[PDB]
Design a protein around this ligand. Structure first.
Ligand SMILES: N[C@@H](C1CCCCC1)P(=O)(O)O
Ligand SMILES: [Co+2]
Ligand SMILES: [Co+2]
Ligand SMILES: [K+]
Length: 304
């Protein structure tokens, strides 16, 4: 394999971490290939669940706990900390909240969160590499509680970064928030990509095509598929009671991705940096409830 940038995986990985049996487990947790029969049973359907009030309570709780876990990870970000160390802390924080770390064994993903450094677009695997001053790192958290998943991520600075990193991460965050600000009943899912690409392109960045936002609730990934690029063909119309994520990946160079031999790590083909932010959103009768928002602080960690 020809690496696209300066990053390399740092093996070996620690043996998979167990989750105590008292924590409730999603269907894929015990499938040998980590397949989710409940997701597969709805493959290729574009119908979107309308959440009940019990379903809304469950999503509110799990998304609030997921934010708490992201915040734990944010508190660990500094030069010298390895991504596996971050993942270990995340793992324990999930368990402390009686939640299962959704990514763990999801189609055999080996860790409890994703850590994506510099040219890693998404799904980086936590490993023995210490964070370097100047790096940018996304931690993506997903938790499962009482049958509901909640999903969010943020990109962080490691010590001091360069202006390019500041601009990339800021614009990325703005893309997410401009899309969120448009969410309300009656908006076509396909419109979000128009808004995202327009701001990314105005700042000289591209928009990753291969990965989309997604419905989320009882299933981790389900309808709707939410592309983040312009003139996409996403199916469907927002309605009060819909829950889904938006998670734009924006890159300094070109939009093309490829995947490491590990089967997960997605990297820019040119080796230039990518940034991402994600929230889980509930469409209300008039707008959007950001289920994964911070409750106690005005801004994302990188602006704090
Ligand atoms: N949270 C991410 C996943 C969740 C399942 C395993 C891989 C990481 P996403 O759905 O790509 O935002
Ligand atoms: Co995520
Ligand atoms: Co997601
Ligand atoms: K990255």
């Amino acid at each position: 394999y020809r690496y696209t940038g300066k990053l390399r995986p740092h093996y070996p990985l620690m043996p998979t971490r167990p989750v105590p049996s008292y924590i409730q487990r999603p269907d894929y947790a015990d499938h040998p290939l980590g397949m989710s029969e409940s997701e597969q049973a709805l493959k290729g359907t574009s119908q979107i669940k309308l959440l009940s009030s019990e379903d809304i309570e469950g999503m509110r709780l799990v998304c609030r706990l997921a934010r708490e876990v992201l915040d734990v990870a944010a508190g660990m970000i500094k030069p010298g900390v390895t991504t596996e160390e971050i993942d270990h802390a995340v793992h324990l924080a999930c368990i402390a909240r009686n939640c299962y770390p959704s990514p763990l064994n999801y189609y055999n993903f080996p860790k409890s969160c994703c850590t994506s450094v510099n040219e890693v677009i998404c799904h980086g695997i936590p490993d023995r590499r210490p964070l370097q001053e100047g790096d940018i790192v996304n931690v993506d958290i997903t938790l499962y509680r009482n049958g509901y998943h909640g999903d969010l991520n943020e990109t962080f600075f490691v010590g001091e970064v360069d202006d390019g990193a500041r601009k990339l991460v800021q614009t990325t965050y703005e893309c997410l928030m401009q899309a969120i600000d448009a969410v309300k009943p009656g908006v076509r899912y396909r419109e979000l990509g128009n808004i995202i690409q327009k701001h990314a392109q105005a700042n000289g960045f591209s928009v990753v095509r291969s990965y989309c936002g997604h419905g989320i609730h009882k299933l981790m990934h389900t309808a709707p598929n939410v592309p983040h690029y312009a003139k996409n063909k996403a199916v469907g119309v927002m309605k009060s009671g819909h829950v889904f994520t938006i998670e734009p990946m924006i890159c300094e160079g070109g939009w093309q991705d490829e995947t490491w031999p590990d089967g997960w790590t997605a990297v820019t083909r040119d080796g230039k940096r990518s940034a991402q932010f994600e929230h889980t959103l509930l469409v209300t009768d008039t707008g959007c409830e950001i289920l994964t928002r911070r409750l106690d602080s005005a801004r994302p960690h990188f602006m704090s």
